[PDB]
Amino acid sequence: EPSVFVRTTAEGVARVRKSKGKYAYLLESTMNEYIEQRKPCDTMKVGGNLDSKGYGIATPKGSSLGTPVNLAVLKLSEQGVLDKLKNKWWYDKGECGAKDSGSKEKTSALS
Amino acid sequence: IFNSLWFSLGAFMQQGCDISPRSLSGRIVGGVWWFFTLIIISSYTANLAAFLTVERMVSPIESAEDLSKQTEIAYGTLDSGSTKEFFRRSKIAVFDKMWTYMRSAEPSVFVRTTAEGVARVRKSKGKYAYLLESTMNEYIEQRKPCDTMKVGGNLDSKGYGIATPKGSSLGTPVNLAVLKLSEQGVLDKLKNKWWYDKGECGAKDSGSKEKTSALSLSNVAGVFYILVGGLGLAMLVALIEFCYK
Amino acid sequence: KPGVFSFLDPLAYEIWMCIVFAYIGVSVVLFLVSIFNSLWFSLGAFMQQGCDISPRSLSGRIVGGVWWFFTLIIISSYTANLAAFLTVERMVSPIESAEDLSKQTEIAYGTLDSGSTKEFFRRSKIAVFDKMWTYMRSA
Amino acid sequence: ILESPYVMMKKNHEMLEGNERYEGYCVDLAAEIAKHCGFKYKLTIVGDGKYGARDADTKIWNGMVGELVYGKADIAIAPLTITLVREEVIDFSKPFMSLGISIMIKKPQKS
Amino acid sequence: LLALLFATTAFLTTYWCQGTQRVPFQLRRFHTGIWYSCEEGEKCRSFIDLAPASEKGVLWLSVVSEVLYILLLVVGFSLMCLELLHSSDGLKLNAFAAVFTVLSGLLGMVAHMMYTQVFQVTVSLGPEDWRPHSWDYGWSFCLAWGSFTCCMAASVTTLNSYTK
Ligand SMILES: O=c1[nH]c2cc(C(F)(F)F)c(N3CCOCC3)cc2n(CP(=O)(O)O)c1=O
Ligand SMILES: O=c1[nH]c2cc(C(F)(F)F)c(N3CCOCC3)cc2n(CP(=O)(O)O)c1=O
Numbered sequence: 001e002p003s004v005f006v007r008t009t010a011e012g013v014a015r016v017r018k019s020k021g022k023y024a025y026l027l028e029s030t031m032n033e034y035i036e037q038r039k040p041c042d043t044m045k046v047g048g049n050l051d052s053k054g055y056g057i058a059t060p061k062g063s064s065l066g067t068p069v070n071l072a073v074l075k076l077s078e079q080g081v082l083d084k085l086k087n088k089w090w091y092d093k094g095e096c097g098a099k100d101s102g103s104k105e106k107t108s109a110l111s
Numbered sequence: 112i113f114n115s116l117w118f119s120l121g122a123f124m125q126q127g128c129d130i131s132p133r134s135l136s137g138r139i140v141g142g143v144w145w146f147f148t149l150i151i152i153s154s155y156t157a158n159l160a161a162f163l164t165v166e167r168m169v170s171p172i173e174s175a176e177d178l179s180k181q182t183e184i185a186y187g188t189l190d191s192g193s194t195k196e197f198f199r200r201s202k203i204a205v206f207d208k209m210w211t212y213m214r215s216a217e218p219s220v221f222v223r224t225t226a227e228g229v230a231r232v233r234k235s236k237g238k239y240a241y242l243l244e245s246t247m248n249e250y251i252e253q254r255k256p257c258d259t260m261k262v263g264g265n266l267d268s269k270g271y272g273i274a275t276p277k278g279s280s281l282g283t284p285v286n287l288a289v290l291k292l293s294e295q296g297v298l299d300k301l302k303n304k305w306w307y308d309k310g311e312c313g314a315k316d317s318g319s320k321e322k323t324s325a326l327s328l329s330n331v332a333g334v335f336y337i338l339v340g341g342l343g344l345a346m347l348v349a350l351i352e353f354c355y356k
Numbered sequence: 357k358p359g360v361f362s363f364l365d366p367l368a369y370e371i372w373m374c375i376v377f378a379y380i381g382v383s384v385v386l387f388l389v390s391i392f393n394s395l396w397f398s399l400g401a402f403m404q405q406g407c408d409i410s411p412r413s414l415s416g417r418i419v420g421g422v423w424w425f426f427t428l429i430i431i432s433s434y435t436a437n438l439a440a441f442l443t444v445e446r447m448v449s450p451i452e453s454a455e456d457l458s459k460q461t462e463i464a465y466g467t468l469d470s471g472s473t474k475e476f477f478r479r480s481k482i483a484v485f486d487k488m489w490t491y492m493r494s495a
Numbered sequence: 496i497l498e499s500p501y502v503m504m505k506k507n508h509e510m511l512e513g514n515e516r517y518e519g520y521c522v523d524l525a526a527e528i529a530k531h532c533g534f535k536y537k538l539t540i541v542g543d544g545k546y547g548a549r550d551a552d553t554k555i556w557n558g559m560v561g562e563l564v565y566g567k568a569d570i571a572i573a574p575l576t577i578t579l580v581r582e583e584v585i586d587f588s589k590p591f592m593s594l595g596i597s598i599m600i601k602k603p604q605k606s
Numbered sequence: 607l608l609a610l611l612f613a614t615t616a617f618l619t620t621y622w623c624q625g626t627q628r629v630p631f632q633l634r635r636f637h638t639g640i641w642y643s644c645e646e647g648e649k650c651r652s653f654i655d656l657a658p659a660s661e662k663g664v665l666w667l668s669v670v671s672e673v674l675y676i677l678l679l680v681v682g683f684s685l686m687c688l689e690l691l692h693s694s695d696g697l698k699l700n701a702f703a704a705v706f707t708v709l710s711g712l713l714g715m716v717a718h719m720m721y722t723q724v725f726q727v728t729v730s731l732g733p734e735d736w737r738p739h740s741w742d743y744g745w746s747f748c749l750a751w752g753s754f755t756c757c758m759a760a761s762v763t764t765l766n767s768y769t770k
Contacts, residue, residue: 113413114412114413116413117410117412117413117417117418117421120417120418120421121406121410121421123421123425124424124425124428125403125404125406125424125428126401126406126407126421126424127406128406129406129408129410152428152432155432156432156433156435156436159432159433159436160435160436160439160440163436163437163440164439164440164443164444308490308494309494313461316460316461317461319459319460319461319462320460320461320462322444324441325365325366325367325368325437326366326367326368326371326433326437327368328368328370328371328374330433331371331374331430334426334429335378337422337426338378338381338422338423338426341418341419341422341423342381342385342419344415344418344419345385345388345415345416345419346388348414348415349388349415352414
């Protein structure tokens, strides 16, 4: 009290930014990977993920299309075709760099 | 200009000066630099008190990019397997840079068994890293001495699955079984069991056990060099005064 | 509580030897200006009490300040270490609940090898009691 | 396959018999499938200790794959990486365990 | 003289520390010297220049600093025996003779401090199978500490003759 449950995800992004760190927010890991790369880049993902969830390509039940798709996805994941596009649409399309997280300077002595 | 230089060193921290230009601007502004330099040692002791107390061990690296960009800490995989095959196959350049390193790694960082790769990290005192599967890394980190640890996110998504032969009707109720048990956290309760409850450590129970003590001799001993280096200065300024004699 | 040895706690025993065995090195260096007169002025340069005899600006003045520069770091480290003791010492809070025994693993805790008490943690489905029974089965 | 903490023998495995000589993550998981699907199970250990690889010349799957492809075993409740070359020979279920290559380093205690 | 006698007694240290591995394995007794590790079944080995790879590089400079400590103690007598050559400019040599004896122990204390820095780091290794619940230093190494003040008490009286 008051309700930490927010109406939209974009409201939950800014409410972390508005409450100056004293409001955290829980959302899905891959979307958290994307919003962390978009400017102002003042939000970040911490810790490992709470549970294993998986997005999958969906065909209707009994359709013969799904098994070549099942051979397709397990091939493209094996070749890193997903990972190259994951580098694209999260980091290369991101408004901040991958090594901008590498400039968060650490425990250094006496500012 | 050389007489009162020592009295600026006599105004450096302590040792109240004998020559005092009593009350003019050299007395006041000579106190101003004196006022300034006492702040510097005051913040020194406060920050030094914080470092001796909290004792957080900063992990050196996070990612495989960090192991690629440096060459100080070695890193290896098993001498055979899909993991060695993965870097041999991965056409991402960061993984290819590591595989450029591991092919040129002399002596061979590839170890024969996983248990050899565990102790070789422990034997080389941190300067040999090792790459293995995440869930097995979750288990060995919980087993005593618990001196190894997993750092960074996992390099790729891999999944162990329950396997039935092709065309068997058993697999679809198993497909309904696993997606039910994962939804209820039945796997996660057993994952808590066979990794943490069967683990020889609690990683935060061992994280709740870190309380250290008195300063070693090791911080002082590097400061002996500026002592003895000043002791070599004691004769050289004296021996030229014998040439002034 | 101890005594005389508590005075010696933050600074280690070999360092008590080396703080004096480096202090005696200052002695004839103060007499290299030309040995018992200026020994007190090395003790007068030990922490405080600015010295009356000053070999104004030669190497005995500068290097006499160098040992003086060095020894002011120490006592600061002595003050920093002794505060690091007491801050740890006051933060040791005694156990006042079973939640405290569950959240730590330093002090072991047991029940009888048979009985309803061992059965209770085996039966209690409150997770704090189950965490203790997770510990006692793995004890 | 006998793997910690997935399938391990009991410390009194000579004292015990049947499937109760075993313990581990996949052992309790094999009970949970028998809870869901309702069947008696027989925990068996593969002889060669392989996860199942196909020969280059004779093209023979060994290991646990060779016990499923060549009809020897009925089901493999075991840690097995879902690969494309193993997808075409046997029906995998959905992945119960998202995982990957991780970086095992020594924890630091250095000074 | 007395500074020189207990300096080489550190060179002839046959027990640097006790060694206790009385673990209920069984009861064990070690007596490691400054270089040569004896033990007690009655047996004595070397066990010099142990691991790893930069503590050995300390031990390169450590032995050199052991040599330079003993050589400068010889310089003190050789000029004071030139004093007895003139007792049977003079003040120039005896003032120079006290320089090298003072510069002996300043090198030598660091040589005694690097080998304690050797000893403290290697016990933090827990030496390969000989980690003691001792660490009782010396006993002649404590007597080697008195060699430094006997280099200092030798110097305060020969600069006292230098003033006149
Ligand atoms: O399909 C595969 N499934 C595997 C499953 C496991 C385990 F998790 F134990 F079940 C392991 N191990 C990791 C722990 O130490 C023992 C061996 C290796 C596997 N490998 C070998 P890779 O070729 O080096 O990846 C496969 O190929
Ligand atoms: O009804 C029961 N009443 C009990 C009463 C007592 C006593 F306190 F002595 F009265 C004790 N003890 C606790 C102190 O040590 C001596 C034995 C045990 C009891 N038990 C056994 P539980 O199964 O361990 O609870 C019962 O069952």
